[PDB]
Design a protein around this ligand. Structure first.
Ligand SMILES: CC(=O)N[C@H]1[C@H]([C@H](O)[C@H](O)CO)OC(C(=O)O)=C[C@@H]1O
Length: 379
């Protein structure tokens, strides 16, 4: 009814030289996985990224970005490390929080994946506000043009545009998936930690590009809330959907990121309760209309266990919301739980809706395509 993408205490990765990575799971396995991100290509291939937390579930720990690839509809997976941390600090070196896009970049189908990178910081990234930007931080971008088989680093100007801004201590993708606009523009939702002198600690925004190499920041900022967020393209707006303790928040920009205003069809429509949680938000066509599909946790215990990871439909015209499927109807592991990522595709006449999510330190996959008629009708 499901498959395991990455098995907690059940995977063995190799490093760049081909030596095994001895984690703290049983038998020297990778201990824990978090923060899944997925896409589906024009060939039907599914690629899933996650934080491979070799030693512990903690955010401040030794982490590589794993990638899993399935060509059989999610039944079986081939796995590797896509992005290695710098191996400065055996406790703390890390790459974190993947956000991915599958896109047509000047004719070439490309998977992009963006992760934050730290080495010696022993605290959460929001603690580091003294510098513009933090010297321990980077935001790195990798690509594949071979359907997810190989990844290579992309040289970008992302660090430069953050430095030039001068009011950002660190930036990170919004977690899960970014998007390619109908005109071809690449867009990553972002989270930013502002420098200490800015009265808002966190903001949301996006970065955009034509070629995947040269990126830009818009001039405005959206309120941060819990900062993890996704963007959809709708009706001549970019619309975000942001983590927040309690009710999720959604804003729209009609001027390509200069200004943001509340988006009534999604704002305050789903409750994640205490702490909030990352959620995934995408669009799915229905005729010449769109529906938003959204995944996040109901959090019945009002805590970090983030129970009941659920799929919702948002009617973008009426503002109705309904629960489609509580696809992980379980209490999570409070060491780190609740995150998810959706992926919709129509290849020829075959429509697929997939999800990956956190399940007790593992990453699981489900094919949710049977729900498509219900979601599409919600317009
Ligand atoms: C880069 C990073 O730390 N990401 C982490 C994120 C973050 O700490 C929080 O959004 C405050 O910034 O929180 C969580 C979480 O399970 O809630 C998981 C992520 O691994």
């Amino acid at each position: 009814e499901k498959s395991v993408v990455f098995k907690a205490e059940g995977e063995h990765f190799t490093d760049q030289k081909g030596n095994t990575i001895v984690g703290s799971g049983s038998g020297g396995t990778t201990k824990y996985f978090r923060i899944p991100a997925m896409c589906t290509t024009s060939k039907g291939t599914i690629v899933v990224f996650a934080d491979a937390r070799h030693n512990t579930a903690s955010d401040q720990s030794f982490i590589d970005t794993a990638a899993a690839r399935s060509t059989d509809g999610g039944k079986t997976w081939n796995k590797k490390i896509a992005i290695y941390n710098d191996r400065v600090n055996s406790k703390l070196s890390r790459v974190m929080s993947p956000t991915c896009i599958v896109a047509n970049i000047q004719g070439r189908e490309t998977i992009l994946v963006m992760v934050g990178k730290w080495n010696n910081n022993d605290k959460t990234w929001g603690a580091y506000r003294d510098k513009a930007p933090d010297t321990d931080w980077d935001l790195v971008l990798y690509k594949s043009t071979d359907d997810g088989v190989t990844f290579s680093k992309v040289e970008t100007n992302i660090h430069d545009i953050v430095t030039k801004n001068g009011t950002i201590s660190a930036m990170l993708g919004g977690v899960g998936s970014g998007l390619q606009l109908n005109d071809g523009k690449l867009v990553f939702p972002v989270q930013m930690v502002r420098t200490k002198n800015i009265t808002t600690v966190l903001n949301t925004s996006f970065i955009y590009s034509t070629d995947g190499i040269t990126w830009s920041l818009p001039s405005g900022y959206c309120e941060g809330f819990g900062s993890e967020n996704n963007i959809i393209e709708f009706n001549a707006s970019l619309v975000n959907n942001i983590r927040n303790s309690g009710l999720r928040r959604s804003f729209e920009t009609k001027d390509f990121g200069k200004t943001w205003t509340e988006f009534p069809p999604m704002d305050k429509k789903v409750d994640n309760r205490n702490h909030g949680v990352q959620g995934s938000t995408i669009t799915i066509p229905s005729g010449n209309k769109l529906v938003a599909a959204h995944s996040s946790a109901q959090n019945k215990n009002n805590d970090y266990t983030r129970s009941d990871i659920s799929l919702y439909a948002h009617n973008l015209y009426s503002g109705e919301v309904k629960l489609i499927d509580d696809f992980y109807p379980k209490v999570g592991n409070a060491s780190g739980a609740g995150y998810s990522c959706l992926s919709y595709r129509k290849n020829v006449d075959k429509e697929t809706l997939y999800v990956v999510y956190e399940a007790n330190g593992s990453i699981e996959f489900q094919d949710l395509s049977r729900h498509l008629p219900v979601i599409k009708s919600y317009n």
